[PDB]
A paper describes a structure:
Mycobacterium smegmatis is commonly used as a laboratory surrogate in studying the physiology and pathogenesis of disease-causing mycobacteria, including Mycobacterium tuberculosis, which causes tuberculosis (TB) in human. Next, cryo-EM single-particle analysis was employed to determine its structure. After a cascade of 2D and 3D classification, we were able to obtain a near atomic structure for the MS70S.
With the MS30S map, we modeled 19 proteins and more than 90% of 16S rRNA residues. Compared to the E. coli 70S ribosome (EC70S), h10 and h17 are distinctively shorter in the MS70S, while h9 is about 17-nt longer. Notably, there is no density present at the expected position of bS21 in the 30S map and no bS21 sequence could be found in the M. smegmatis protein database. This position is reminiscent of protein eL41 in eukaryotic ribosomes, which creates a central inter-subunit bridge. For example, protein uS17 bears an extended N-terminus (~13 residues), which establishes a species-specific interaction with h7 and h9 of the 16S rRNA.
Author numbering:
A (entry chain K): 24 to 138
B (entry chain O): 2 to 87
C (entry chain U): 2 to 26
D (entry chain R): 27 to 81
E (entry chain F): 1 to 10, 29 to 85
RNA sequence: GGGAGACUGGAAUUCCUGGUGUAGCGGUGGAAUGCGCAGAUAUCAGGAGGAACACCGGUGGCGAAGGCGGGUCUCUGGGCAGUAACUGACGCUGAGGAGCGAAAGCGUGGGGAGCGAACAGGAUUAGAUACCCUGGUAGUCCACGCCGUAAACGGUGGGUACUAGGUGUGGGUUUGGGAUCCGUGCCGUAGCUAACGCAUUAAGUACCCCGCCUGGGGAGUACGGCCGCAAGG
C-alpha cells in the first residue's frame, strides 16, 4: 500500500505517459497510450490518454491509492482527458499544477522544420 | 578622465598665467597625462578596442593643438615640447 | 527592386566559382 | 522614496508576480529609471535568496 | 569607498547588523534557513578584494555579496 | 545591454552511479531506420561538464559603424544639459594612407552538453545527389594571430543655416501645469519627385568638400600589379 501518493502525466505531441507514484518518487504502476493497444499516430490522440489513464487509475487500486496529487508535464492534447478519467475511474483529485520545464534560455533547439 | 585634485597639479604647473585652463600650452598638458594613463591601461587589457578609439582621438586632438601653437609663435611651441617630451 | 537583376548577376558568380574549384592546381 | 534596495522584500513582493517573474512597466506604470532599479534589486535579492525564481 | 557586505551561514567597520533569522527561498548547499549579517564597511577597494578571499574560504558564512 | 578582466549564480539539455519500477519508447502526413526486454522512456536522489542568460524588454537605451542583456567589484572610452571663468576661428571636408569591421573560413594549442554543413541508413518519388526522419565529423566555444567580405540598408556621404503645425516616448534644465536645448517614432501644409513617397531626424531652399555613374550582356571577368599561409579580396 501507498495510502497517499502523486501522479505524473507527461503528454508530448506524439504520446501520453501516465505514471502514478508515492510522494518520495518510487513508482507503483504506470500506463502509456501505446500500452493500451495503439501504434503510430493513435498514441497521440485525445482518446488515447482517456483509455490509458483509466488503466493508470487501476493498478493504483490494486495497491490501494485513494488520493493522488497531479502533475502536468509537456504540451499536448488530452490535458483534460487525463485529469477527468482519473476522477471518473476513482481516486478524487488532490491538487493540479503545471510542471512543464521552462529553460532560462538553456541549450539551443533544433532547426526549424518546414513541411 | 583624471581625478579632480590630480587635474589641478598639471594645470597650475603648465598654465600660462593663472585660471587659464583652455590655453593650448595648458590644454595639451591635460591630454598628455591622460594618454600616459591610457597607454598603461591598454598594456594590461590589450583587446579593449573601444577605449583605444578614444586614445587616437586624444592624440588627433593633441596634434592639432601642436599645429596651432607652432603657427602662432615658435618659442612657446619648442618650450611645450622641451618640458613634456613628444 | 525586382530580383531579375540579381538572379542574372547570381549565375555569373556560380559559373565562375565552379572554375576556381576545378582549376585550383 | 520609497527608497529602493534589495534589503526590503515588502517592496519587491509588490512588483513580483506569484509565479515569481518581474512585472511589466505596462502593468504597474513606473518610470524607466525605477524598472531598472527594481529589476536589478530583484536580481540582487535573487542571489541573496530572499526571493524565489518561481513558485 | 562606501560598500556593504551581507553574509549568510548557520579599514573602518562603520556598523554591524545581524538580523539573525529568515527562511531561505531556495535551499543553498543543502541546509535550510540561516543568519543574515550585514557588515556595512567603509574600507578601500583593494583590501576588500582580498577580504572576500579570507571570508569565503572559512565556510563560516555561506554566501557573499558586495556594493 | 558602450568596452575589457576576474570572481560567481539558478533553471534547462545530455551522459555516469544508485533508488522504484514493466515492455514499450521515439518519430510522422502516414511510417520505417533507431534505442529496450543484458531492464529503455517515465519518476526521485545526488554528481561531473559545457554553452546560453527566460520575465524585466519594447518601434526603449548606448555605440563611428559591425554591434551590445544573469549578478557584483575593479579598470575604462564617448555623449547630453547648465551657468559662464579661460584660450581667441585653433573650424569643415579629406585624393592616396592608417585603424576598427557580423557570419563563414584559415594556422598552432586547449575544450566539447545541445545544435550540426559533408557522410551514412529509413521514407517520399518516374528519379531524390533534396524537403521530412534517427545517428553525426568539421564547426559553433576559449586564447593568441589571419583575411577584410554581407540586403555591411534609412539601399539616402560629412558639415552648416533657414522654412506650418499635430502628436507619442527616452535624458536634462527651468519657472499639478507652461516654456527650453538634445534624442527617437507616427500622421501632415507649402515645396519637391517619373510615380511610389520624402516632409524640421527631407528626397524642400542654399553654400563648401569628397566618393561614384554615362545602354543591356561579356564582367566585377581577363591580363599586369599589390595584399594573403590558403580560400580568395
Ligand atoms: Mg563662474
Ligand atoms: Mg580613401
Ligand atoms: Mg567566427
Ligand atoms: Mg579554428
Ligand atoms: Mg538533420
Ligand atoms: Mg561591398
Ligand atoms: Mg545589419
Ligand atoms: Mg540601383
Ligand atoms: Mg547634407
Ligand atoms: Mg509623412
Ligand atoms: Mg577578381
Ligand atoms: Mg592577377
Amino acid at each position: 500500500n501507498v495510502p497517499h501518493g502523486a501522479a505524473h502525466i507527461k503528454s508530448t505531441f506524439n504520446n501520453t505517459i501516465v505514471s502514478i507514484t508515492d510522494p518520495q518518487g518510487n513508482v507503483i504502476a504506470w500506463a502509456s497510450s501505446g500500452h493500451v493497444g495503439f501504434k503510430g499516430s493513435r498514441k497521440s490522440t485525445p482518446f488515447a490518454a482517456q483509455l490509458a489513464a483509466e488503466n493508470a487509475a487501476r493498478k493504483a487500486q490494486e495497491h490501494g491509492v485513494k488520493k493522488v496529487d497531479v502533475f502536468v508535464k509537456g504540451p499536448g492534447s488530452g490535458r483534460e482527458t487525463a485529469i477527468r478519467s482519473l476522477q471518473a475511474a476513482g481516486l478524487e483529485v488532490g491538487t493540479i499544477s503545471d510542471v512543464t520545464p521552462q529553460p532560462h534560455n538553456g541549450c539551443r533547439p533544433p532547426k526549424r522544420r518546414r513541411v | 578622465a583624471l581625478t579632480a585634485e590630480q587635474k589641478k597639479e598639471i594645470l597650475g604647473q603648465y598654465g600660462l598665467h593663472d585660471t587659464d585652463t583652455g590655453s593650448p600650452e595648458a590644454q595639451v598638458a591635460l591630454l598628455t597625462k591622460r594618454i600616459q594613463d591610457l597607454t598603461e591601461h591598454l598594456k594590461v587589457h590589450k583587446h579593449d578596442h573601444h577605449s583605444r578609439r578614444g586614445l587616437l582621438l586624444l592624440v588627433g586632438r593633441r596634434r592639432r593643438l601642436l599645429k596651432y601653437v607652432a603657427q602662432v609663435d615658435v618659442a612657446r611651441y619648442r618650450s611645450l615640447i622641451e618640458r613634456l617630451g613628444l | 527592386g525586382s530580383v531579375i537583376k540579381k538572379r542574372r548577376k547570381r549565375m555569373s558568380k556560380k559559373k565562375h566559382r565552379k572554375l576556381l574549384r576545378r582549376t585550383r592546381v | 522614496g520609497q527608497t529602493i534596495d534589495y534589503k526590503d522584500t515588502a517592496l519587491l513582493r509588490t512588483y513580483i508576480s506569484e509565479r515569481g517573474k518581474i512585472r511589466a512597466r505596462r502593468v504597474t506604470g513606473n518610470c524607466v529609471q525605477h524598472q531598472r532599479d527594481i529589476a536589478v534589486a530583484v536580481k540582487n535579492a535573487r542571489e541573496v535568496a530572499l526571493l524565489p525564481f518561481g513558485s | 569607498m562606501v560598500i556593504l557586505d551581507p553574509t549568510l551561514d548557520e579599514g573602518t567597520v562603520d556598523k554591524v547588523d545581524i538580523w539573525g533569522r529568515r527562511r531561505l527561498a531556495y535551499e543553498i548547499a543543502k541546509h535550510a534557513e540561516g543568519i543574515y549579517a550585514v557588515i556595512d564597511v567603509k574600507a578601500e577597494p583593494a583590501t576588500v578584494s582580498e577580504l572576500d578571499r579570507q571570508l569565503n574560504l572559512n565556510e563560516s558564512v555561506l554566501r557573499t555579496k558586495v556594493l
